[PDB]
Symmetry: C3
Subunit: 255 residues, 3 copies
C-alpha cells in the first residue's frame, strides 16, 4: 500500500502521479526542506510501492532551497517526526536504522525509472546526496552544492560517495569533501555535477522538456538500456558486449 498524501505530508513530502511520471516534492519550506529519518523511510516506501506505469521520477523542493540537509533536531536524543534518532539510540540496531535510511536513496538507481533532481538554491549534505542519487540533475543558476558532513565530523553515508566519484573523479571528490566547500551552478556544470543549468525561472520548463524527450523513447528499450549502462563500468569489454547482445535478443524478439 502506497503512503497516503496525509502520511506523506506528515513526513514533509508530496507525491503526485500523472501517467508515467511521478513528482516527489520536499515540502518543509520553512525549514528549507531539512530531512528527517521519517522523510527517508517514506521515500523508500514511495519507491517500493510506485505503480508499474511510472518510469520517470522528478524530485524537487518547495521554496528557494532544494534541501538544507539533515534536520538539526536529528542531532538530539528526542524523537523526530515520531521516530528515534541515531542519538536516541546511542544514549547493530544503529546499523539497521542507517540501512533503512539508505533505502530512501538506493531505489533511484532502479533500471525501470529515470530519476531527475531539479535543484534550486542550496543542496547540503543529505540533500546533495539525494541529488547525486538521481540519474540526472538539472540545476537552477541559483544552485549551490556542498558536502558538509565531514565539517560536522561525519562521513557521507546516504549513498552519495559512489555517484560523486563517478561524476567528478576521486581526486576532485577528495577536494570537495575534505574542504566541505560550496560549489556554485557554473562550477557544478563544469564538473559534470549538473547535466544542464538554466535560469531559475526556467527550471520547471527545462524539467518538462526533458520529461517529454524521455517519454518519446519506448519504455522497454529505455529500461533495458539503463540496465546496460549501469553495468558497463565494472564489466570487461568482452562481457559487456555479451550483455548488450543478450539484451538485444529480447528487444528484437518484441519487435
Amino acid at each position: 500500500k502506497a503512503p497516503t498524501a496525509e502520511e506523506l505530508a506528515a513526513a514533509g513530502l508530496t507525491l503526485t502521479i500523472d501517467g508515467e511520471v511521478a513528482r516527489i516534492t520536499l515540502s518543509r519550506p520553512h525549514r528549507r526542506n531539512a530531512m528527517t529519518g521519517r522523510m527517508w523511510t517514506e521515500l523508500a516506501r514511495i519507491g517500493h510501492t510506485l505503480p508499474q506505469a511510472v518510469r520517470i521520477v522528478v524530485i524537487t523542493g518547495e521554496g528557494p532551497t532544494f534541501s538544507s540537509g539533515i534536520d538539526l533536531d536529528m542531532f538530539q536524543a528526542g524523537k523526530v517526526d515520531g521516530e528515534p534518532t541515531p542519538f536516541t539510540l546511542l544514549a547493530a540496531a544503529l546499523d539497521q536504522v542507517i540501512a533503512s535510511y539508505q533505502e530512501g536513496f538506493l531505489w533511484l538507481r532502479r533500471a525501470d525509472i529515470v530519476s531527475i533532481a531539479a535543484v534550486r538554491g542550496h543542496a547540503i549534505g543529505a540533500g546533495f546526496q539525494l541529488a547525486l542519487s538521481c540519474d540526472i540533475r538539472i540545476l537552477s543558476d541559483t544552485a549551490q552544492l556542498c558536502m558538509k558532513e565531514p565539517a560536522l565530523g561525519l562521513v557521507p553515508d546516504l549513498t552519495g560517495t559512489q555517484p560523486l566519484v563517478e561524476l567528478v573523479g576521486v581526486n576532485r571528490a577528495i577536494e570537495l569533501c575534505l574542504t566541505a566547500r560550496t560549489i556554485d551552478a557554473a562550477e557544478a556544470a563544469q564538473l559534470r555535477l549538473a547535466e544542464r543549468v538554466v535560469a531559475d525561472a526556467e527550471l520547471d520548463a527545462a524539467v518538462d522538456a526533458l520529461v517529454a524527450q524521455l517519454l518519446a523513447v519506448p519504455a522497454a528499450a529505455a529500461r533495458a538500456t539503463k540496465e546496460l549502462l549501469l553495468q558497463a563500468g565494472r564489466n570487461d569489454l568482452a562481457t559487456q558486449a555479451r550483455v548488450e547482445r543478450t539484451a538485444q535478443l529480447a528487444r528484437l524478439a518484441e519487435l
Copy 2:
C-alpha cells in the same frame, strides 16, 4: 588472406595501407554510409588480417556524413549485401550473428593499434558506436552524434555502451541514450566525446598531424603503454604498479 579491394568495395569499404598507417573509409556516400552486416563482418576480417607493420588505423567516411547508422534495409526479411538479416532469422543463431557483427568493432581496442575516428556530419547509432570504439575521435565542427537505438526500441549492442560510459560518465550516458538526442561538436568536445574539434576543411590535416605525432613515438613503447592504460581502471593501485613495472623490465631490456 586479407579482403581484396573488390570484395571491400562490394561491402561499402575502402582500405589503403601506407607503411605503418591503415585508412579505412566507409564508402556508400549515396546512402550516407549506412552500415550493413556484410560491412561489419568485413571490418572484422580487415582487423584480423592487417599486416603486423600497421600500428595506426584511421576510420573516415566518404561525403558529408560519417555514418547514418544501420541501413534501414537491415530491418526487412530480405538478404542485404548477400547476407541474412536478424529479421530474416526471426522470420542461438541470432546471438551468433550479432557476435559476428561485434567483432567488427572489438578489434579497434587492440593494444598494437591506435584507432582514430575522423567524423564529419552525423554519426548515428551504429555509426556513433563505431566512433566510440576507436581510441581517439577528431570531429569536424559539422559533427553531430546520436545514440538512436533506444528511439527505435533497441539497445546499443555494437560495443558502444562501455566507451560511452567511460567518456561521459554513467549519468550523462543515461541522459544521452534515453533521450536519443543529438549532440553537436561543441558539446561533444565539452563532454570528452571528441579529443579535438577542428574546422571541416582542416579535418584531414588534423588527422595527419596526429598520425605524425603517434609515429614519432616508438612502436613497442606505444603498444606496451596502451596495454597498461587499458588495465588501469579495473586494477587496484598495487596491482597496476606491479603491471607497470613488469612492462618496464621488458622495455629496459630492449634498451
Copy 3:
C-alpha cells in the same frame, strides 16, 4: 627514524613540518629538479616516518620547473647519488629496485594524508607521475605537463597510469601518452588534471588557502571520508553503501 635534513639535502629534497602540515620541496633547481633513485627512496622513507600528527603533505619544487623528470645520469651505468641505476644492473633484482622506487609515490594515496602537488613550469615523465600521485594538483599558469616516457622507448612505471586514466579517461590517456605531447595549464584544467590554476605569483597563496580549508575539517572525518572515496569506484553500490554506514557508526560513536 626519519631522514635528517642533511640526508635529504644530499638526495635533493627539503622537508619541513609545521603542526599538521608537511612540505616537501624538490631542491635541485640547477638540474630543474631532475629525479634520481635516491630521491625516490628518500621520499618513501619520509612517507614511512612522518609524525602521526601530519595530515596534509604539500609537494613543491625550487625554481621555475616542478621537475624535469628522471635525471639523465640514471641512463648511464655509473652510480648516481651513491646508488646503482637500472643500467648498472643490466650491465628479479631490477624488479625489486623499481618496486623500491614506486614506494616513493604510493604513500601519497594514504587515507590519513591529503597530498597536494603545487606545480609551476614543466612536470615531465617521472615529475608528471609525482603530481598525478598526489590527491590534488594546483597549477601555476606557467605549468606544462608531459608523459615523455614512451618517446624514450619506456612506459610510465612510477604509478602514474591509474590516476591519469581516472582523471582524463582511458581514451584521452592514450592520446596524451602515445603522442607524448605537452599539455599547458589551461588544457590541464579543462581535462581535470588540475583542480585549480592560478597566476604564478599566487600559487603559494592558493596552496595556503587550500591547506586552511582542509585543516578546518576535523582530522578523523577527513581520513574516514578519504578512505570511503578511494573504494567507491571499484565497489558495487550495495557494498559502498554498507561501507559508508560502517564508517558512520564509528564517527557517531565518537560524537
